[PDB]
A and B are shown apart, each in its own frame.
With several copies, the nearest count.
Chain A
Amino acid sequence: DPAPATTFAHLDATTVLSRAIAELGIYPAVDPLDSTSRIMDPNIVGSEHYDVARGVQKILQDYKSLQDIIAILGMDELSEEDKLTVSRARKIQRFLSQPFQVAEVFTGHLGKLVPLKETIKGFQQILAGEYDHLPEQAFYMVGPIEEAVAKADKLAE
């Protein structure tokens, strides 16, 4: 749309929110394959931050192009390394969600603020495979990686 389209260029960082993503209950409904920052560069945020982020988008984009395909062609036909990137992306999507302090009236959840390093570490760990045994819904609407692990036990009974 002329209006929003003409605005992008006046910006150093763009957070793009999506109805499709909000519809799934993922809040904030930020689209990770369409949000950008000028400073998302290793010379600036460092090679550790940059690599993680890029990875998160990689598995997410890989997943996105498998979606419509395995939706009809069945899950079972997938390679055991492919259907792991399916399980991991689906967890990272949830781990992108987060209860907000100002949205307590909407969530039922307590607001949580995640320090930068803890975010990098949490995601680094999911990409690594350290939580393939943890259930999807454990990563949903929590703060730092600890609370996903704790949430996993509460769901075990």
Chain B
Amino acid sequence: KQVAGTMKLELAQYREVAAFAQFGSDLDAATQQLLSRGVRLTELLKQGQYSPMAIEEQVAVIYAGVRGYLDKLEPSKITKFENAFLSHVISQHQALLSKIRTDGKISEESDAKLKEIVTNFLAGFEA
């Protein structure tokens, strides 16, 4: 409910703008960020077939986008990212996955663990 609401609002401001995408050379920083976010949240909504996700797994990946960590990452690269990032959090941070569920929402603690897992993981990716 939490991350969803942001994504929903942010994709809608995107949809307000997504026409100035391929014909926008002289856009203001604000509408340039609506597109960027828009294009990336869009990539996070893509999904492979025959592989449904646990709800906490979804929120962890939506989290990447809604918190802006992918804003500087190439659109074409996002699906590759998600696959590696999710494998990592299911492999090493099962505990953290255990806590996004239990808590109902994302605690300050879960907001801490993610803030660091992503930042470092991402740096490793683009390295």
Contact = CB atoms under 8 A, between A and B. Distances in A.
A157 interface: no
A41 B25 CA distance: 37
B81 to A, nearest CB: 17
Contacts of A79: 22, 25
A55 B29 CA distance: 31
A78 interface: yes
Interface residues of A, number: 7
Contacts of B25: 79
Interface residues of B, number: 4
Contacts of B23: 73, 77-78
Nearest to B25: A79
A66 interface: yes
A66 B23 CA distance: 10
B43 to A, nearest CB: 13
Contacts of B49: 41
A132 interface: no
A97 B105 CA distance: 33
A78 B22 CA distance: 7
A82 interface: yes
A36 to B, nearest CB: 14
Contacts of B22: 66, 78-79, 82
Contacts of A41: 49
B59 to A, nearest CB: 24
A144 B49 CA distance: 32
A20 to B, nearest CB: 11
A41 B48 CA distance: 11
Interface in A53-106: 66, 73, 77-79, 82
Which of B22, B23, B25, B49: most chain A CB closer than 10 A? B22
A41 B50 CA distance: 11
Interface string B51-78: 0000000000000000000000000000
Nearest to B19: A69
Interface string B7-22: 0000000000000001
A131 B115 CA distance: 43
A44 to B, nearest CB: 12
9 contacts: A41-B49, A66-B22, A73-B23, A77-B23, A78-B22, A78-B23, A79-B22, A79-B25, A82-B22
The 8 residue pairs across chains A and B that have the minimum distance between CB atoms: A82-B22, A77-B23, A79-B22, A66-B22, A79-B25, A78-B22, A73-B23, A78-B23
